[PDB]
């Protein structure tokens, strides 16, 4: 738990913390959250929705979605509580909780999530129990506005699991059985409309039970945090148009977009055009200066890890854990 969140969680209702299902949804840098609309898929009792509530401030909004009756009941009891806590009045809530399958946000209750209405979709470990990943990714793409991002953590595999592993109920409940191979994930999310997957962080996930490991003997599992922007002008490849981006300051000493691009305050950093377009069309533009496109210069190589930048996801992930 990041320090900047600790004081806010101390202010969140003990019943929300005590009954919360799962691990916290990871968030983009606090400063970038100001005024955003955030949607948490599988919000549980609302721990992350309330944390985001504060971080987005009074001009932001947070929406939580879940299908667990008891979780939501708890969530919905503390709306006034946290409005008082954060904003000073019980009537000043910027959160709402909706009941529904994450696969179809359009028909949640009391209301659905409309097209192009969300800046950030967050979630932690929801995909491998999803009933239909493609449909889930398509629904995320639908609700995001242009320049919005899916910023999420989940478990992935370095190879395709066997049928036997995919049928095992303990592997399934542990979010391993339903894990995609990293390249299959890349193709699936691209079919849903996310043409550029950026690796934020990765940790190893171990299967130590020797019985279960026999179903996935040499499989390496990872918990990966990815950010996938919805930006109309993204291409499948990372092309150089001679651009630089300069982080202007104001949401930290430096801005780390992903494991390839770190932007120190007031220093120009060469960027491929996808990265430029992400900065320009997303909410991040507020804190950046991005130079004009020149003539195409070929594949983007002005990065000290440009080889890995263009490589398959499995190589990026495997090398970042090293
Ligand atoms: As999970
Ligand atoms: Ca959750
Ligand atoms: Ca491997
Ligand atoms: Cl899990």
Automatic annotation (TrEMBL):
Q: One MF term from GO for this chain?
A: metal ion binding
- Say yes or no: keyword 4Fe-4S present: no
User: What keywords sit in the KW lines?
Assistant: Calcium, Metal-binding, Methyltransferase, S-adenosyl-L-methionine, Transferase
In which residues is Ca(2+) 2 bound? Answer: 158, 220
Q: List the disulfide bonds.
A: 23-125
GO biological processes: methylation
Q: Where is the Methyltransferase domain?
A: 34-193
Q: Which reaction does it catalyse?
A: arsenic triglutathione + [thioredoxin]-dithiol + S-adenosyl-L-methionine + 2 H2O = methylarsonous acid + [thioredoxin]-disulfide + 3 glutathione + S-adenosyl-L-homocysteine + H(+); arsenic triglutathione + 3 [thioredoxin]-dithiol + 3 S-adenosyl-L-methionine = trimethylarsine + 3 [thioredoxin]-disulfide + 3 glutathione + 3 S-adenosyl-L-homocysteine + 3 H(+); arsenic triglutathione + 2 [thioredoxin]-dithiol + 2 S-adenosyl-L-methionine + H2O = dimethylarsinous acid + 2 [thioredoxin]-disulfide + 3 glutathione + 2 S-adenosyl-L-homocysteine + 2 H(+)
Residue sites binding Ca(2+) 1 per the record: 42
Chain residues that bind S-adenosyl-L-homocysteine: 21, 66, 102-103
UniProt family annotation: Belongs to the methyltransferase superfamily. Arsenite methyltransferase family.
Annotated protein name in UniProt: Arsenite methyltransferase
State the organism named in the record. Cyanidioschyzon sp. 5508
């Amino acid at each position: 738990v990041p320090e900047s969140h600790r004081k806010i969680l101390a202010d969140i209702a003990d019943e929300v913390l005590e009954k919360f299902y799962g691990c916290g949804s990871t968030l983009p840098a606090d400063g970038s959250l100001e005024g955003a609309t955030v949607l948490d898929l599988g919000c549980g009792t609302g721990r992350d929705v309330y944390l985001a509530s504060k971080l987005v401030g009074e001009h932001g909004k947070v929406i939580g979605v879940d299908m667990l009756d008891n979780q939501l009941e708890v969530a919905r009891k503390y709306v006034e509580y946290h409005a008082e806590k954060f904003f000073g009045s019980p009537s000043r809530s910027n959160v709402r909780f909706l009941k529904g399958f994450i696969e179809n946000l359009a028909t949640a209750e009391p209301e659905g999530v409309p097209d192009s209405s969300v800046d950030i979709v967050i979630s932690n470990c929801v995909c491998n129990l999803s009933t239909n990943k493609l449909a889930l990714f398509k629904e995320i793409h639908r609700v995001l506005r242009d320049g919005g991002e899916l910023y999420f953590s989940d478990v992935y595999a370095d190879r395709r699991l066997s049928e036997a592993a995919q049928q095992d109920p303990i592997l399934y409940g542990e979010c391993l059985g339903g894990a995609l191979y990293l390249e299959d994930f890349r193709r699936l999310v691209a079919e849903a409309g996310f043409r550029d997957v950026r690796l934020v962080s990765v940790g190893p996930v171990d299967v130590s039970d020797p019985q279960l490991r026999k179903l996935v003997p040499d499989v390496q599992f990872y918990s990966c945090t990815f950010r996938c922007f919805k930006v109309a002008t993204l291409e499948a490849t990372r092309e150089d148009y001679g651009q630089s981006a300069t982080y202007l300051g104001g949401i930290g000493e430096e801005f780390k977009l992903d494991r390839f691009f770190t932007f120190p305050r007031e220093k120009p950093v060469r960027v491929d055009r996808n990265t430029a377009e992400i900065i320009r069309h997303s909410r991040l533009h507020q804190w950046f200066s991005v130079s004009a496109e020149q003539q195409h210069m070929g594949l983007f190589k002005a990065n000290d890890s440009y080889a890995l930048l263009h490589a398959p996801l499995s190589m990026q992930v495997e090398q970042l854990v090293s």
